[PDB]
Design an enzyme around this catalytic site. Sequence first.
Site, mmCIF file in Angstrom:
data_model
loop_
_atom_site.group_PDB
_atom_site.id
_atom_site.type_symbol
_atom_site.label_atom_id
_atom_site.label_comp_id
_atom_site.label_asym_id
_atom_site.label_seq_id
_atom_site.Cartn_x
_atom_site.Cartn_y
_atom_site.Cartn_z
ATOM 1 C CE1 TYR A 87 -3.977 -2.050 0.541
ATOM 2 C CE2 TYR A 87 -2.708 -3.124 2.277
ATOM 3 C CZ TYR A 87 -3.809 -3.087 1.445
ATOM 4 O OH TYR A 87 -4.738 -4.095 1.528
ATOM 5 C CG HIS B 287 -2.642 -1.589 -4.084
ATOM 6 N ND1 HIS B 287 -3.832 -1.626 -4.774
ATOM 7 C CD2 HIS B 287 -2.828 -2.333 -2.969
ATOM 8 C CE1 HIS B 287 -4.702 -2.365 -4.109
ATOM 9 N NE2 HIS B 287 -4.118 -2.805 -3.010
ATOM 10 C CD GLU C 98 -7.021 -0.964 -2.244
ATOM 11 O OE1 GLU C 98 -7.252 -1.225 -1.048
ATOM 12 O OE2 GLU C 98 -7.384 -1.698 -3.185
ATOM 13 N NE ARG D 233 -7.543 -1.942 1.923
ATOM 14 C CZ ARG D 233 -7.744 -2.729 2.974
ATOM 15 N NH1 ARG D 233 -8.171 -2.223 4.121
ATOM 16 N NH2 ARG D 233 -7.544 -4.037 2.872
ATOM 17 C CG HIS E 20 -12.461 -5.767 1.945
ATOM 18 N ND1 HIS E 20 -12.676 -5.951 0.597
ATOM 19 C CD2 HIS E 20 -11.136 -5.534 2.087
ATOM 20 C CE1 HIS E 20 -11.527 -5.840 -0.048
ATOM 21 N NE2 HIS E 20 -10.578 -5.587 0.833
ATOM 22 C CG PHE F 16 -13.611 -2.554 -1.560
ATOM 23 C CD1 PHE F 16 -13.180 -2.358 -0.255
ATOM 24 C CD2 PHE F 16 -12.676 -2.875 -2.535
ATOM 25 C CE1 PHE F 16 -11.835 -2.477 0.076
ATOM 26 C CE2 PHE F 16 -11.330 -2.997 -2.218
ATOM 27 C CZ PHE F 16 -10.909 -2.793 -0.909
HETATM 28 N N1 LIG Z 1 -12.734 -5.437 -4.905
HETATM 29 C C1 LIG Z 1 -11.710 -4.792 -5.456
HETATM 30 N N2 LIG Z 1 -10.486 -5.138 -5.128
HETATM 31 C C2 LIG Z 1 -9.501 -4.412 -5.714
HETATM 32 C C3 LIG Z 1 -9.664 -3.389 -6.596
HETATM 33 N N3 LIG Z 1 -8.429 -2.874 -6.981
HETATM 34 C C4 LIG Z 1 -7.565 -3.596 -6.316
HETATM 35 N N4 LIG Z 1 -8.123 -4.563 -5.507
HETATM 36 C C5 LIG Z 1 -7.352 -5.499 -4.581
HETATM 37 O O1 LIG Z 1 -7.276 -6.797 -5.178
HETATM 38 C C6 LIG Z 1 -7.552 -7.808 -4.179
HETATM 39 C C7 LIG Z 1 -8.200 -9.028 -4.853
HETATM 40 O O2 LIG Z 1 -9.293 -8.686 -5.724
HETATM 41 C C8 LIG Z 1 -8.497 -7.138 -3.196
HETATM 42 O O3 LIG Z 1 -8.475 -7.746 -1.888
HETATM 43 C C9 LIG Z 1 -7.960 -5.706 -3.170
HETATM 44 O O4 LIG Z 1 -6.905 -5.492 -2.261
HETATM 45 P P1 LIG Z 1 -7.090 -4.723 -0.867
HETATM 46 O O5 LIG Z 1 -7.635 -5.736 0.064
HETATM 47 O O6 LIG Z 1 -5.676 -4.367 -0.685
HETATM 48 O O7 LIG Z 1 -8.000 -3.589 -1.118
HETATM 49 C C10 LIG Z 1 -10.988 -3.018 -6.954
HETATM 50 O O8 LIG Z 1 -11.302 -2.140 -7.742
HETATM 51 N N5 LIG Z 1 -11.963 -3.778 -6.329
#
Ligand SMILES: Nc1nc2c(ncn2[C@@H]2O[C@H](CO)[C@@H](O)[C@H]2OP(=O)(O)O)c(=O)[nH]1
Length: 104
Positions: A38, A40, A58, A77, A92, A100
């Site tokens: 992070y 990212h 995020e 986040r 989440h 999300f």
């Molecule tokens: N759901 C979701 N996950 C994302 C997105 N961009 C990056 N991710 C990251 O990719 C992982 C697998 O889909 C997620 O757990 C999330 O990490 P974070 O938990 O760090 O947010 C997005 O637009 N949506």
Amino acid sequence: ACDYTCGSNCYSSSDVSTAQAAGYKLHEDGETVGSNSYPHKYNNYEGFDFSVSSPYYEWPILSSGDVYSGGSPGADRVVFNENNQLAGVITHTGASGNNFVECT
Ligand SMILES: Nc1nc2c(ncn2[C@@H]2O[C@H](CO)[C@@H](O)[C@H]2OP(=O)(O)O)c(=O)[nH]1
Ligand SMILES: [Ca+2]
């Protein structure tokens, strides 16, 4: 009252600003923290209608009030863009799998 409610976690605008500032600084310096690296890119697969332009990034916001420094990022986040503009606060919590939902 909470400016942002992520499940059971309550955040004020100051909590968000503080978290965002830390995440943006790391982004500008090209550095990361944590096993998930992070801050990212946030791809916005969810399709949220943010009022600010992408790219989005995020960064974890913690219910402890401390700035993320590694370890478990929790479920919440802050999402900011290239101009350090707040896009939104997401979580989440209350979402299936790794999806999300926006904090209220
Ligand atoms: N759901 C979701 N996950 C994302 C997105 N961009 C990056 N991710 C990251 O990719 C992982 C697998 O889909 C997620 O757990 C999330 O990490 P974070 O938990 O760090 O947010 C997005 O637009 N949506
Ligand atoms: Ca707080």
